[PDB]
Write a structure and sequence with these properties.
This protein has 97 residues and is α+β, with helices and mostly antiparallel strands. 15% of the residues lie in helices and 24% in strands. The longest helix has 9 residues.
């Protein structure tokens, strides 16, 4: 039987862990300003069909009003989880699957 007379062509990358190799949950991130024009949350709506086995969003925008821009989009088509939060001179919302 051969001992060292074997030329490997591929590498063995076995990593026994309790969590996945990477994270494909965080769908999109809208950390700018709550614009009324359909431009930012455009990803949110398009995310609905492109949905997967685990979605997430992170929006950090600033607006003088109280209405949520990005969340309003996903809420329209109706996603899985749509939540929001506020701090002070800004506001941050997030969604998941």
């Amino acid at each position: 039987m051969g001992s060292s007379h074997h030329h490997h062509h591929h590498s063995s990358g076995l990593v026994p862990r309790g969590s996945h190799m990477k994270n494909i949950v965080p769908d999109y991130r809208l950390d700018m300003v709550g614009e009324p024009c359909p431009y930012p949350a455009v990803a949110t709506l398009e995310a609905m069909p492109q949905l997967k086995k685990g979605e997430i969003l992170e929006v950090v925008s600033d607006c003088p009003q109280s209405i949520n821009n990005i969340p309003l989009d996903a809420r329209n088509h109706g996603y899985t989880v749509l939540d929001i939060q506020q701090d002070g001179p800004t506001i941050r919302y997030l969604i998941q699957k």
